[PDB]
Write an enzyme that holds these catalytic residues in place. Sequence first.
Site, PDB file in Angstrom:
ATOM      1  N   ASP A  22       0.830  -1.191   0.000  1.00 44.88           N
ATOM      2  CA  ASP A  22       0.000   0.000   0.000  1.00 44.88           C
ATOM      3  C   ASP A  22       0.873   1.253   0.000  1.00 44.88           C
ATOM      4  O   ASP A  22       2.098   1.189  -0.144  1.00 44.88           O
ATOM      5  CB  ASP A  22      -0.948  -0.036   1.201  1.00 44.88           C
ATOM      6  CG  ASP A  22      -0.233   0.207   2.523  1.00 44.88           C
ATOM      7  OD1 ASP A  22       1.018   0.184   2.550  1.00 44.88           O
ATOM      8  OD2 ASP A  22      -0.925   0.414   3.541  1.00 44.88           O
ATOM      9  N   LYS A  43      -1.757  -7.830   6.915  1.00 44.90           N
ATOM     10  CA  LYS A  43      -2.177  -6.478   7.260  1.00 44.90           C
ATOM     11  C   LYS A  43      -1.889  -6.257   8.736  1.00 44.90           C
ATOM     12  O   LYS A  43      -2.393  -7.001   9.585  1.00 44.90           O
ATOM     13  CB  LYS A  43      -3.664  -6.301   6.957  1.00 44.90           C
ATOM     14  CG  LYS A  43      -4.286  -5.006   7.412  1.00 44.90           C
ATOM     15  CD  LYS A  43      -5.708  -4.906   6.863  1.00 44.90           C
ATOM     16  CE  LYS A  43      -6.256  -3.495   6.972  1.00 44.90           C
ATOM     17  NZ  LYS A  43      -7.699  -3.429   6.602  1.00 44.90           N
ATOM     18  N   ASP A 135     -17.326   1.457   3.339  1.00 45.49           N
ATOM     19  CA  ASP A 135     -16.285   2.193   2.619  1.00 45.49           C
ATOM     20  C   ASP A 135     -16.157   1.667   1.177  1.00 45.49           C
ATOM     21  O   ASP A 135     -15.054   1.406   0.691  1.00 45.49           O
ATOM     22  CB  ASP A 135     -14.939   2.114   3.355  1.00 45.49           C
ATOM     23  CG  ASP A 135     -14.034   3.262   2.972  1.00 45.49           C
ATOM     24  OD1 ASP A 135     -14.532   4.318   2.533  1.00 45.49           O
ATOM     25  OD2 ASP A 135     -12.824   3.138   3.099  1.00 45.49           O
TER      26      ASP A 135
HETATM   27  N1  LIG Z   1      -6.262  -9.621  -0.597  1.00 48.61           N
HETATM   28  C1  LIG Z   1      -5.498  -8.580  -1.254  1.00 48.61           C
HETATM   29  N2  LIG Z   1      -4.960  -9.115  -2.340  1.00 48.61           N
HETATM   30  C2  LIG Z   1      -4.184  -8.353  -3.148  1.00 48.61           C
HETATM   31  N3  LIG Z   1      -3.961  -7.050  -2.854  1.00 48.61           N
HETATM   32  C3  LIG Z   1      -4.511  -6.508  -1.750  1.00 48.61           C
HETATM   33  C4  LIG Z   1      -5.273  -7.258  -0.951  1.00 48.61           C
HETATM   34  N4  LIG Z   1      -5.697  -6.497   0.067  1.00 48.61           N
HETATM   35  C5  LIG Z   1      -5.195  -5.272  -0.101  1.00 48.61           C
HETATM   36  N5  LIG Z   1      -4.459  -5.278  -1.215  1.00 48.61           N
HETATM   37  C6  LIG Z   1      -3.754  -4.093  -1.738  1.00 48.61           C
HETATM   38  O1  LIG Z   1      -3.307  -3.323  -0.638  1.00 48.61           O
HETATM   39  C7  LIG Z   1      -3.998  -2.043  -0.621  1.00 48.61           C
HETATM   40  C8  LIG Z   1      -4.233  -1.599   0.802  1.00 48.61           C
HETATM   41  O2  LIG Z   1      -4.913  -2.589   1.558  1.00 48.61           O
HETATM   42  P1  LIG Z   1      -6.459  -2.431   1.913  1.00 48.61           P
HETATM   43  O3  LIG Z   1      -6.857  -0.976   1.810  1.00 48.61           O
HETATM   44  O4  LIG Z   1      -6.616  -2.856   3.353  1.00 48.61           O
HETATM   45  O5  LIG Z   1      -7.230  -3.197   0.865  1.00 48.61           O
HETATM   46  C9  LIG Z   1      -5.238  -2.293  -1.466  1.00 48.61           C
HETATM   47  O6  LIG Z   1      -5.823  -1.101  -1.961  1.00 48.61           O
HETATM   48  C10 LIG Z   1      -4.697  -3.208  -2.553  1.00 48.61           C
HETATM   49  O7  LIG Z   1      -3.932  -2.473  -3.497  1.00 48.61           O
END
Ligand SMILES: Nc1ncnc2c1ncn2[C@@H]1O[C@H](COP(=O)(O)O)[C@@H](O)[C@H]1O
Lengths: 267, 264
Positions: A22, A43, A135
Amino acid sequence: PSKSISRVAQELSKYEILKKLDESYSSVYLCKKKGEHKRFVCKIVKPSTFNSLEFDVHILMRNNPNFIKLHNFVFNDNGESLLIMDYVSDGDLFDFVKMNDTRELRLNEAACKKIIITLVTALNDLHKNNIVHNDVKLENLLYDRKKKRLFVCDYGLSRIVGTPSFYDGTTVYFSPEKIRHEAYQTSFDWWAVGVVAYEILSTEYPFDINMDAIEPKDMLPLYSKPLPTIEHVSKKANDFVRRMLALDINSRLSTYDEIIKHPFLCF
Amino acid sequence: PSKSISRVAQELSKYEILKKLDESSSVYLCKKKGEHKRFVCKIVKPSTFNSLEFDVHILMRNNPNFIKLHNFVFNDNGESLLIMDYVSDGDLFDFVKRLNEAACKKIIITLVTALNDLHKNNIVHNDVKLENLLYDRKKKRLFVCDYGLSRIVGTPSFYDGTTVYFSPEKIRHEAYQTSFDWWAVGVVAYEILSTEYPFDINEDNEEEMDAIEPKDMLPLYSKPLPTIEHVSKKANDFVRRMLALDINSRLSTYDEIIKHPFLC
Ligand SMILES: Nc1ncnc2c1ncn2[C@@H]1O[C@H](COP(=O)(O)O)[C@@H](O)[C@H]1O
Ligand SMILES: Nc1ncnc2c1ncn2[C@@H]1O[C@H](COP(=O)(O)O)[C@@H](O)[C@H]1O
């Protein structure tokens, strides 16, 4: 048995960090078990910031192909908490509308129709639990042009239907009702779906803005202006987004049944 | 980075199991390296964990009448763990098997207030009972426990929990709602004030309490509530209205309950 504890330490000690994914309450990393192929997403959430409902969404939607499976999760009151989840895709719907498009990404009307049907169906499945995602936006809808599979992600702002709302999430996706501090409700998600639908169909944001200073009440005047026609999509597609984003909820597709029965989403 | 995984594993490695806490999910007493404070580690069976049990812990973290959760480990292909405060060596059931009216009034105010705070999240405990109300006799402190059957308001209900605490509305398969908890509070209130179960069955005959069907509770609610002899008329009026069969005659909301003379 006391082997459980050390097994937790043993299992979650196999994961190795490959990169930061991210760009904050949370940070997301590419992970991998040592010597093993599969890529996961780990995460890390800061202490005293976790939304416990994020765990429920993963579990409740474990068997839905459009949500993300949670493999491990460690919460600590006095430290960081970990969510180890599948890696499902490198792309999202924002990649298909952004200005910097070096890879010739495009979504035609048929692709938008399929995405919207899947999104509406998936969010409805979540809503049966009286939980809203809260969201929904392009960046939280993973999608690539090879799988063509839509994954809803980032359940960190999810809420229980009926509880008092506050200004969490992204202002420019706020429904009139969320701006007015109505209780969390499915219509919050449906409005955001409407914005997403307008964006993928037109590649433009529906309302009249260019932004760090934009406030919830600043959105209301904008919702009062006409919704621009999307020139090169069908009349049914245009009628869909108009009715998805009607200022007056009594003129809006604000329920699952209203949305899924609109001509645009029918065959 | 990867240092976060190391630290996360390290924190959980500080706990050591001291002994199991039953002869009966399995609950264990645990100790932490460098603390005299004890904890309760609850190992829940794979595939059968109610996710909302975690939420109640977290949402009620700062409420002194709920149990603080320190760590939670989930494994989609293993056993899940909850590490929580150890708060008391007994509960209101053990303690009733001589509470005077004043002591019962405090317990009820605390319980009603604590459950109202939970209901602000549109979550219902859904298994309120003497055995799920831990009670520290030294400090006269009450703790609501065992959120394993908690539910979100408005979801369809099923016959989970303890039949003899079921409300008329739960027996009739109404959606989960705060009034489920308030009916159970009425039974608890009657029990601690009287030392007895309000309705006409032998609560010491276990097999019978466990076997009675939800539908067979409804005739029992028709009967007049026995008067509690050596408590106030205000107290008797309270339990009578907490357990009125007709919900229009019942204290079925927080505002209604907390405004009753007995609780004022
Ligand atoms: N299960 C996932 N698989 C692949 N990329 C992910 C995944 N989750 C998050 N990402 C990437 O990480 C960024 C930040 O995580 P999140 O906002 O929690 O989705 C996302 O906008 C995606 O670009
Ligand atoms: N913090 C605690 N302190 C003492 N006993 C507990 C505690 N937590 C649970 N127990 C016992 O374990 C049962 C269920 O565990 P719990 O998950 O805490 O609800 C209770 O009904 C008690 O018999």
